[PDB]
Amino acid sequence: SNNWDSHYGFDKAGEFHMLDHTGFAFPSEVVNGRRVLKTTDNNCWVNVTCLQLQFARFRFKSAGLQAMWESYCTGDVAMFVHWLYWLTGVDKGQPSDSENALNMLSKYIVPAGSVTIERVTHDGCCCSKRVVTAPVVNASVLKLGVEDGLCPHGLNYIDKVVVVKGTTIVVNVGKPVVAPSHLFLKGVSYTTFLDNGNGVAGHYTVFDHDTGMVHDGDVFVPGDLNVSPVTNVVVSEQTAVVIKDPVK
Ligand SMILES: [Zn+2]
């Protein structure tokens, strides 16, 4: 069998490699410097998955995936988009979950950060910490975090992100959450999931912190983060100069 797994860096690459991807060439544009897809066929989970990859400035470990990803950013989107549907097993035309997609993508991404999550009671009687270097971390998107059971002394453990080094995507635990903007972890971008009315699934968009505008499909719309249920946040302290390695 032709050895495609080492080029692409994912299982069954040889199957994917031969597939026709043209069915996934969604119309795309550049809005505020980001590659975005026109809303169609319930593809908003794809749009916001790829937006957060861009906001995070992530790169993929393998030659094949990174070339696919770079093609996506420059507007040749079909192969990377097809791979997302292929990997997650989602049917074209059906709505899906961006957080689930991002969690699947994590193992393929070049590590770029470190997240410290503290589990502590309010008087400090019990305290523990873990350091996560996965590109995608599952934790509260709120500064105050989440309650996580009782300690032996009868207080609630509070589980919260206390340090982020580099860049990460924090995927909220629990349902999409609404709060005043300043109570969220401070991030460059916020994926939100809003009610879209009867008959249709909720709608995915990405709130852009620096402009205060919202990526909605391929348009830029006014938004209010204070009333938008957040599902994930890109937390990033960016580097000034991009560093690449010479090709061997
Ligand atoms: Zn305790």
PDB file of C-alpha atoms and ligand atoms in Angstrom:
ATOM      1  CA  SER A   1       0.000   0.000   0.000  1.00  0.00           C
ATOM      2  CA  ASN A   2       1.304   3.484  -0.897  1.00  0.00           C
ATOM      3  CA  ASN A   3       2.725   5.121   2.251  1.00  0.00           C
ATOM      4  CA  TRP A   4       0.530   8.217   2.702  1.00  0.00           C
ATOM      5  CA  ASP A   5       0.196   8.182   6.495  1.00  0.00           C
ATOM      6  CA  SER A   6       3.625   9.741   7.064  1.00  0.00           C
ATOM      7  CA  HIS A   7       2.986  12.531   4.543  1.00  0.00           C
ATOM      8  CA  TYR A   8      -0.490  13.412   5.832  1.00  0.00           C
ATOM      9  CA  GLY A   9      -0.053  12.441   9.472  1.00  0.00           C
ATOM     10  CA  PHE A  10      -3.469  10.894  10.032  1.00  0.00           C
ATOM     11  CA  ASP A  11      -4.833   7.341   9.852  1.00  0.00           C
ATOM     12  CA  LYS A  12      -6.255   6.060   6.540  1.00  0.00           C
ATOM     13  CA  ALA A  13      -4.640   8.931   4.628  1.00  0.00           C
ATOM     14  CA  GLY A  14      -4.388   6.616   1.599  1.00  0.00           C
ATOM     15  CA  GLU A  15      -8.166   6.465   1.396  1.00  0.00           C
ATOM     16  CA  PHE A  16      -8.641  10.217   1.708  1.00  0.00           C
ATOM     17  CA  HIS A  17      -5.821  10.975  -0.721  1.00  0.00           C
ATOM     18  CA  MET A  18      -7.677   9.575  -3.715  1.00  0.00           C
ATOM     19  CA  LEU A  19     -11.070  11.152  -3.005  1.00  0.00           C
ATOM     20  CA  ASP A  20     -12.721  13.815  -5.160  1.00  0.00           C
ATOM     21  CA  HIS A  21     -12.895  16.923  -2.951  1.00  0.00           C
ATOM     22  CA  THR A  22     -14.674  19.262  -5.363  1.00  0.00           C
ATOM     23  CA  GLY A  23     -18.043  18.783  -3.642  1.00  0.00           C
ATOM     24  CA  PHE A  24     -16.670  20.736  -0.701  1.00  0.00           C
ATOM     25  CA  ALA A  25     -15.445  23.806  -2.579  1.00  0.00           C
ATOM     26  CA  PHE A  26     -17.630  26.220  -0.604  1.00  0.00           C
ATOM     27  CA  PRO A  27     -17.554  29.853  -1.818  1.00  0.00           C
ATOM     28  CA  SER A  28     -15.049  31.789   0.313  1.00  0.00           C
ATOM     29  CA  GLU A  29     -13.894  35.376   0.853  1.00  0.00           C
ATOM     30  CA  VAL A  30     -11.436  37.365   2.937  1.00  0.00           C
ATOM     31  CA  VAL A  31     -13.044  39.484   5.676  1.00  0.00           C
ATOM     32  CA  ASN A  32     -10.896  41.511   8.083  1.00  0.00           C
ATOM     33  CA  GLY A  33      -7.886  39.471   6.996  1.00  0.00           C
ATOM     34  CA  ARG A  34      -9.533  36.086   7.596  1.00  0.00           C
ATOM     35  CA  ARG A  35     -10.581  33.358   5.187  1.00  0.00           C
ATOM     36  CA  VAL A  36     -14.320  32.784   5.616  1.00  0.00           C
ATOM     37  CA  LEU A  37     -17.020  30.628   4.020  1.00  0.00           C
ATOM     38  CA  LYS A  38     -20.390  31.752   2.727  1.00  0.00           C
ATOM     39  CA  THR A  39     -23.224  30.438   4.910  1.00  0.00           C
ATOM     40  CA  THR A  40     -24.684  27.430   3.082  1.00  0.00           C
ATOM     41  CA  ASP A  41     -25.561  23.759   3.612  1.00  0.00           C
ATOM     42  CA  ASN A  42     -25.352  24.245   7.415  1.00  0.00           C
ATOM     43  CA  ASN A  43     -21.595  24.721   7.078  1.00  0.00           C
ATOM     44  CA  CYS A  44     -21.258  27.259   9.867  1.00  0.00           C
ATOM     45  CA  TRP A  45     -19.531  24.731  12.165  1.00  0.00           C
ATOM     46  CA  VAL A  46     -16.796  24.553   9.509  1.00  0.00           C
ATOM     47  CA  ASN A  47     -16.550  28.312   9.136  1.00  0.00           C
ATOM     48  CA  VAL A  48     -16.008  28.946  12.839  1.00  0.00           C
ATOM     49  CA  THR A  49     -13.745  25.925  13.325  1.00  0.00           C
ATOM     50  CA  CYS A  50     -11.401  27.304  10.649  1.00  0.00           C
ATOM     51  CA  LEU A  51     -11.716  30.886  11.924  1.00  0.00           C
ATOM     52  CA  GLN A  52     -10.435  29.860  15.347  1.00  0.00           C
ATOM     53  CA  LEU A  53      -7.542  27.973  13.733  1.00  0.00           C
ATOM     54  CA  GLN A  54      -6.631  31.248  12.040  1.00  0.00           C
ATOM     55  CA  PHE A  55      -7.068  33.426  15.113  1.00  0.00           C
ATOM     56  CA  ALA A  56      -4.826  30.983  17.012  1.00  0.00           C
ATOM     57  CA  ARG A  57      -2.180  31.045  14.243  1.00  0.00           C
ATOM     58  CA  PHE A  58      -1.930  27.261  14.597  1.00  0.00           C
ATOM     59  CA  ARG A  59       0.096  25.048  12.249  1.00  0.00           C
ATOM     60  CA  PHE A  60      -0.267  21.321  11.582  1.00  0.00           C
ATOM     61  CA  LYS A  61       2.540  18.847  12.302  1.00  0.00           C
ATOM     62  CA  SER A  62       2.482  17.008   8.966  1.00  0.00           C
ATOM     63  CA  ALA A  63       3.497  18.258   5.522  1.00  0.00           C
ATOM     64  CA  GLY A  64       0.217  17.148   3.989  1.00  0.00           C
ATOM     65  CA  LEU A  65      -2.170  18.699   6.519  1.00  0.00           C
ATOM     66  CA  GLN A  66      -0.264  21.966   6.651  1.00  0.00           C
ATOM     67  CA  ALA A  67      -0.304  22.234   2.863  1.00  0.00           C
ATOM     68  CA  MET A  68      -4.076  21.557   2.933  1.00  0.00           C
ATOM     69  CA  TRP A  69      -4.532  24.162   5.640  1.00  0.00           C
ATOM     70  CA  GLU A  70      -2.402  26.746   3.851  1.00  0.00           C
ATOM     71  CA  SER A  71      -4.439  26.114   0.664  1.00  0.00           C
ATOM     72  CA  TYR A  72      -7.607  26.730   2.648  1.00  0.00           C
ATOM     73  CA  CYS A  73      -6.332  30.080   3.890  1.00  0.00           C
ATOM     74  CA  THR A  74      -5.440  31.181   0.352  1.00  0.00           C
ATOM     75  CA  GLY A  75      -8.911  30.238  -0.890  1.00  0.00           C
ATOM     76  CA  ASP A  76      -8.491  26.699  -2.266  1.00  0.00           C
ATOM     77  CA  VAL A  77     -10.707  25.315   0.470  1.00  0.00           C
ATOM     78  CA  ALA A  78     -12.092  22.031  -0.849  1.00  0.00           C
ATOM     79  CA  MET A  79      -9.531  19.525   0.363  1.00  0.00           C
ATOM     80  CA  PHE A  80      -9.280  20.820   3.931  1.00  0.00           C
ATOM     81  CA  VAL A  81     -13.068  21.203   4.227  1.00  0.00           C
ATOM     82  CA  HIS A  82     -13.637  17.697   2.891  1.00  0.00           C
ATOM     83  CA  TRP A  83     -11.117  16.394   5.447  1.00  0.00           C
ATOM     84  CA  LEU A  84     -13.105  17.971   8.284  1.00  0.00           C
ATOM     85  CA  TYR A  85     -16.293  16.196   7.164  1.00  0.00           C
ATOM     86  CA  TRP A  86     -14.379  12.992   6.490  1.00  0.00           C
ATOM     87  CA  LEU A  87     -12.609  13.027   9.885  1.00  0.00           C
ATOM     88  CA  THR A  88     -15.713  13.851  11.941  1.00  0.00           C
ATOM     89  CA  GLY A  89     -17.980  11.628   9.843  1.00  0.00           C
ATOM     90  CA  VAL A  90     -20.464  14.452   9.243  1.00  0.00           C
ATOM     91  CA  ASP A  91     -22.699  14.479   6.118  1.00  0.00           C
ATOM     92  CA  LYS A  92     -22.441  17.497   3.835  1.00  0.00           C
ATOM     93  CA  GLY A  93     -25.569  19.572   4.413  1.00  0.00           C
ATOM     94  CA  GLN A  94     -25.939  18.640   8.082  1.00  0.00           C
ATOM     95  CA  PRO A  95     -25.190  20.877  11.073  1.00  0.00           C
ATOM     96  CA  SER A  96     -22.465  19.830  13.499  1.00  0.00           C
ATOM     97  CA  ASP A  97     -20.379  20.757  16.550  1.00  0.00           C
ATOM     98  CA  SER A  98     -17.285  22.953  16.165  1.00  0.00           C
ATOM     99  CA  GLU A  99     -15.983  22.152  19.660  1.00  0.00           C
ATOM    100  CA  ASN A 100     -16.087  18.435  18.886  1.00  0.00           C
ATOM    101  CA  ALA A 101     -14.203  19.114  15.629  1.00  0.00           C
ATOM    102  CA  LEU A 102     -11.569  21.246  17.375  1.00  0.00           C
ATOM    103  CA  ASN A 103     -11.056  18.542  20.012  1.00  0.00           C
ATOM    104  CA  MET A 104     -10.444  16.018  17.201  1.00  0.00           C
ATOM    105  CA  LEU A 105      -8.005  18.398  15.515  1.00  0.00           C
ATOM    106  CA  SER A 106      -5.898  18.983  18.627  1.00  0.00           C
ATOM    107  CA  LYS A 107      -3.579  15.960  18.230  1.00  0.00           C
ATOM    108  CA  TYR A 108      -2.576  17.116  14.716  1.00  0.00           C
ATOM    109  CA  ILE A 109      -1.549  20.650  15.677  1.00  0.00           C
ATOM    110  CA  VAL A 110       1.965  21.850  16.546  1.00  0.00           C
ATOM    111  CA  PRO A 111       1.907  22.652  20.297  1.00  0.00           C
ATOM    112  CA  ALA A 112       1.975  26.402  20.850  1.00  0.00           C
ATOM    113  CA  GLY A 113       1.072  27.024  24.454  1.00  0.00           C
ATOM    114  CA  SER A 114       0.660  25.950  28.028  1.00  0.00           C
ATOM    115  CA  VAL A 115      -2.448  26.285  30.176  1.00  0.00           C
ATOM    116  CA  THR A 116      -2.455  26.038  33.958  1.00  0.00           C
ATOM    117  CA  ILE A 117      -5.771  24.968  35.482  1.00  0.00           C
ATOM    118  CA  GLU A 118      -6.198  25.376  39.225  1.00  0.00           C
ATOM    119  CA  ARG A 119      -8.659  23.386  41.311  1.00  0.00           C
ATOM    120  CA  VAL A 120      -9.055  25.173  44.617  1.00  0.00           C
ATOM    121  CA  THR A 121     -11.490  25.926  47.434  1.00  0.00           C
ATOM    122  CA  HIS A 122     -12.242  29.477  48.506  1.00  0.00           C
ATOM    123  CA  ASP A 123     -10.139  29.363  51.686  1.00  0.00           C
ATOM    124  CA  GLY A 124      -7.309  27.394  50.082  1.00  0.00           C
ATOM    125  CA  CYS A 125      -7.794  24.288  52.227  1.00  0.00           C
ATOM    126  CA  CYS A 126      -7.402  22.103  49.138  1.00  0.00           C
ATOM    127  CA  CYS A 127      -5.483  23.064  46.012  1.00  0.00           C
ATOM    128  CA  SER A 128      -4.114  21.261  42.976  1.00  0.00           C
ATOM    129  CA  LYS A 129      -2.892  22.333  39.533  1.00  0.00           C
ATOM    130  CA  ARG A 130      -2.427  20.764  36.136  1.00  0.00           C
ATOM    131  CA  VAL A 131      -0.517  22.008  33.139  1.00  0.00           C
ATOM    132  CA  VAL A 132      -2.022  21.233  29.735  1.00  0.00           C
ATOM    133  CA  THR A 133      -0.022  21.574  26.505  1.00  0.00           C
ATOM    134  CA  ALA A 134      -2.732  20.306  24.147  1.00  0.00           C
ATOM    135  CA  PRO A 135      -3.547  23.049  21.602  1.00  0.00           C
ATOM    136  CA  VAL A 136      -7.232  22.612  22.494  1.00  0.00           C
ATOM    137  CA  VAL A 137      -8.085  22.644  26.222  1.00  0.00           C
ATOM    138  CA  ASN A 138     -11.427  21.801  27.804  1.00  0.00           C
ATOM    139  CA  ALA A 139     -12.072  24.186  30.688  1.00  0.00           C
ATOM    140  CA  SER A 140     -14.335  27.051  31.728  1.00  0.00           C
ATOM    141  CA  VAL A 141     -14.264  30.122  29.515  1.00  0.00           C
ATOM    142  CA  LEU A 142     -15.111  32.175  32.640  1.00  0.00           C
ATOM    143  CA  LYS A 143     -12.426  33.755  34.809  1.00  0.00           C
ATOM    144  CA  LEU A 144     -14.285  32.453  37.875  1.00  0.00           C
ATOM    145  CA  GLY A 145     -14.425  28.950  36.448  1.00  0.00           C
ATOM    146  CA  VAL A 146     -16.796  26.152  37.485  1.00  0.00           C
ATOM    147  CA  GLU A 147     -17.753  24.278  40.660  1.00  0.00           C
ATOM    148  CA  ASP A 148     -16.394  20.742  40.575  1.00  0.00           C
ATOM    149  CA  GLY A 149     -17.530  18.738  43.620  1.00  0.00           C
ATOM    150  CA  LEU A 150     -16.811  18.856  47.365  1.00  0.00           C
ATOM    151  CA  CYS A 151     -13.425  18.754  49.039  1.00  0.00           C
ATOM    152  CA  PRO A 152     -13.015  16.653  52.212  1.00  0.00           C
ATOM    153  CA  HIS A 153     -13.556  19.808  54.299  1.00  0.00           C
ATOM    154  CA  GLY A 154     -16.963  20.434  52.762  1.00  0.00           C
ATOM    155  CA  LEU A 155     -16.167  23.299  50.376  1.00  0.00           C
ATOM    156  CA  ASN A 156     -16.662  23.386  46.614  1.00  0.00           C
ATOM    157  CA  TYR A 157     -13.649  22.853  44.402  1.00  0.00           C
ATOM    158  CA  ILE A 158     -13.438  25.671  41.851  1.00  0.00           C
ATOM    159  CA  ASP A 159     -11.811  24.679  38.564  1.00  0.00           C
ATOM    160  CA  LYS A 160     -10.459  27.641  36.576  1.00  0.00           C
ATOM    161  CA  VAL A 161      -7.801  28.668  34.068  1.00  0.00           C
ATOM    162  CA  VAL A 162      -5.224  30.748  35.913  1.00  0.00           C
ATOM    163  CA  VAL A 163      -2.321  30.988  33.437  1.00  0.00           C
ATOM    164  CA  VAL A 164      -2.064  30.792  29.636  1.00  0.00           C
ATOM    165  CA  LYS A 165       1.369  30.837  28.012  1.00  0.00           C
ATOM    166  CA  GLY A 166       1.486  31.144  24.251  1.00  0.00           C
ATOM    167  CA  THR A 167      -1.731  30.345  22.425  1.00  0.00           C
ATOM    168  CA  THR A 168      -4.583  27.942  23.153  1.00  0.00           C
ATOM    169  CA  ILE A 169      -8.231  27.383  22.324  1.00  0.00           C
ATOM    170  CA  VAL A 170     -10.277  26.990  25.523  1.00  0.00           C
ATOM    171  CA  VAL A 171     -13.375  24.925  24.847  1.00  0.00           C
ATOM    172  CA  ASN A 172     -16.073  25.591  27.449  1.00  0.00           C
ATOM    173  CA  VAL A 173     -17.291  22.769  29.664  1.00  0.00           C
ATOM    174  CA  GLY A 174     -21.083  22.627  29.896  1.00  0.00           C
ATOM    175  CA  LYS A 175     -23.650  24.588  27.883  1.00  0.00           C
ATOM    176  CA  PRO A 176     -22.928  27.757  25.873  1.00  0.00           C
ATOM    177  CA  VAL A 177     -22.554  30.530  28.462  1.00  0.00           C
ATOM    178  CA  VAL A 178     -23.743  34.130  28.598  1.00  0.00           C
ATOM    179  CA  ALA A 179     -21.894  36.703  30.687  1.00  0.00           C
ATOM    180  CA  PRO A 180     -20.634  40.301  30.699  1.00  0.00           C
ATOM    181  CA  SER A 181     -17.635  40.397  28.363  1.00  0.00           C
ATOM    182  CA  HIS A 182     -15.146  41.267  31.091  1.00  0.00           C
ATOM    183  CA  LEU A 183     -15.949  38.075  33.048  1.00  0.00           C
ATOM    184  CA  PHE A 184     -14.709  35.810  30.219  1.00  0.00           C
ATOM    185  CA  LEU A 185     -11.101  34.802  29.821  1.00  0.00           C
ATOM    186  CA  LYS A 186      -9.616  37.609  27.711  1.00  0.00           C
ATOM    187  CA  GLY A 187      -9.234  36.310  24.183  1.00  0.00           C
ATOM    188  CA  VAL A 188      -8.738  37.515  20.628  1.00  0.00           C
ATOM    189  CA  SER A 189     -11.902  35.759  19.426  1.00  0.00           C
ATOM    190  CA  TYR A 190     -15.005  34.071  20.807  1.00  0.00           C
ATOM    191  CA  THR A 191     -17.055  31.421  19.084  1.00  0.00           C
ATOM    192  CA  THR A 192     -20.716  31.914  19.923  1.00  0.00           C
ATOM    193  CA  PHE A 193     -23.836  29.828  19.321  1.00  0.00           C
ATOM    194  CA  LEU A 194     -27.123  31.717  19.103  1.00  0.00           C
ATOM    195  CA  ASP A 195     -30.782  30.839  18.661  1.00  0.00           C
ATOM    196  CA  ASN A 196     -31.712  31.085  14.976  1.00  0.00           C
ATOM    197  CA  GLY A 197     -35.484  30.625  15.317  1.00  0.00           C
ATOM    198  CA  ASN A 198     -37.902  27.704  14.870  1.00  0.00           C
ATOM    199  CA  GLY A 199     -37.157  25.152  12.166  1.00  0.00           C
ATOM    200  CA  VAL A 200     -33.368  25.429  12.139  1.00  0.00           C
ATOM    201  CA  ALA A 201     -30.372  24.650  14.371  1.00  0.00           C
ATOM    202  CA  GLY A 202     -28.689  27.403  16.392  1.00  0.00           C
ATOM    203  CA  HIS A 203     -26.179  29.521  14.478  1.00  0.00           C
ATOM    204  CA  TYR A 204     -22.368  29.606  14.892  1.00  0.00           C
ATOM    205  CA  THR A 205     -20.442  32.900  14.558  1.00  0.00           C
ATOM    206  CA  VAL A 206     -17.134  34.311  15.831  1.00  0.00           C
ATOM    207  CA  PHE A 207     -16.878  37.535  17.807  1.00  0.00           C
ATOM    208  CA  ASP A 208     -13.729  39.504  16.926  1.00  0.00           C
ATOM    209  CA  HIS A 209     -12.327  41.204  20.045  1.00  0.00           C
ATOM    210  CA  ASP A 210     -10.327  44.010  18.384  1.00  0.00           C
ATOM    211  CA  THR A 211     -13.112  45.335  16.144  1.00  0.00           C
ATOM    212  CA  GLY A 212     -16.079  44.324  18.286  1.00  0.00           C
ATOM    213  CA  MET A 213     -17.606  42.942  15.063  1.00  0.00           C
ATOM    214  CA  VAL A 214     -18.807  39.404  14.315  1.00  0.00           C
ATOM    215  CA  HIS A 215     -17.764  36.970  11.584  1.00  0.00           C
ATOM    216  CA  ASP A 216     -21.088  35.581  10.342  1.00  0.00           C
ATOM    217  CA  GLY A 217     -20.449  33.318   7.365  1.00  0.00           C
ATOM    218  CA  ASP A 218     -18.621  35.606   4.948  1.00  0.00           C
ATOM    219  CA  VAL A 219     -19.916  38.930   6.291  1.00  0.00           C
ATOM    220  CA  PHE A 220     -18.964  41.234   9.171  1.00  0.00           C
ATOM    221  CA  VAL A 221     -21.909  42.125  11.394  1.00  0.00           C
ATOM    222  CA  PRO A 222     -22.350  44.249  14.506  1.00  0.00           C
ATOM    223  CA  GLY A 223     -22.387  42.159  17.658  1.00  0.00           C
ATOM    224  CA  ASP A 224     -22.738  42.182  21.415  1.00  0.00           C
ATOM    225  CA  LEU A 225     -20.580  39.674  23.285  1.00  0.00           C
ATOM    226  CA  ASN A 226     -22.493  40.424  26.471  1.00  0.00           C
ATOM    227  CA  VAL A 227     -25.541  38.558  25.148  1.00  0.00           C
ATOM    228  CA  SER A 228     -23.853  35.904  22.968  1.00  0.00           C
ATOM    229  CA  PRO A 229     -23.562  32.348  24.367  1.00  0.00           C
ATOM    230  CA  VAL A 230     -19.867  31.477  24.200  1.00  0.00           C
ATOM    231  CA  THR A 231     -18.623  27.955  23.337  1.00  0.00           C
ATOM    232  CA  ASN A 232     -14.859  28.537  22.954  1.00  0.00           C
ATOM    233  CA  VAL A 233     -12.219  31.268  23.122  1.00  0.00           C
ATOM    234  CA  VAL A 234      -8.820  31.786  21.531  1.00  0.00           C
ATOM    235  CA  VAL A 235      -6.492  33.005  24.265  1.00  0.00           C
ATOM    236  CA  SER A 236      -3.227  34.182  22.768  1.00  0.00           C
ATOM    237  CA  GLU A 237      -0.067  36.069  23.590  1.00  0.00           C
ATOM    238  CA  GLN A 238       1.317  36.350  20.098  1.00  0.00           C
ATOM    239  CA  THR A 239       4.971  36.382  19.138  1.00  0.00           C
ATOM    240  CA  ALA A 240       6.368  39.297  17.106  1.00  0.00           C
ATOM    241  CA  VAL A 241       8.240  37.384  14.401  1.00  0.00           C
ATOM    242  CA  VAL A 242       7.106  34.108  12.819  1.00  0.00           C
ATOM    243  CA  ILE A 243       9.765  31.393  13.092  1.00  0.00           C
ATOM    244  CA  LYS A 244       9.983  28.616  10.500  1.00  0.00           C
ATOM    245  CA  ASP A 245      12.530  25.809  10.139  1.00  0.00           C
ATOM    246  CA  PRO A 246      14.510  25.307   6.917  1.00  0.00           C
ATOM    247  CA  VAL A 247      13.343  22.281   4.892  1.00  0.00           C
ATOM    248  CA  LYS A 248      15.719  19.318   5.198  1.00  0.00           C
TER     249      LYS A 248
HETATM  250 ZN    ZN B   1     -10.579  21.180  51.551  1.00  0.00          ZN
END
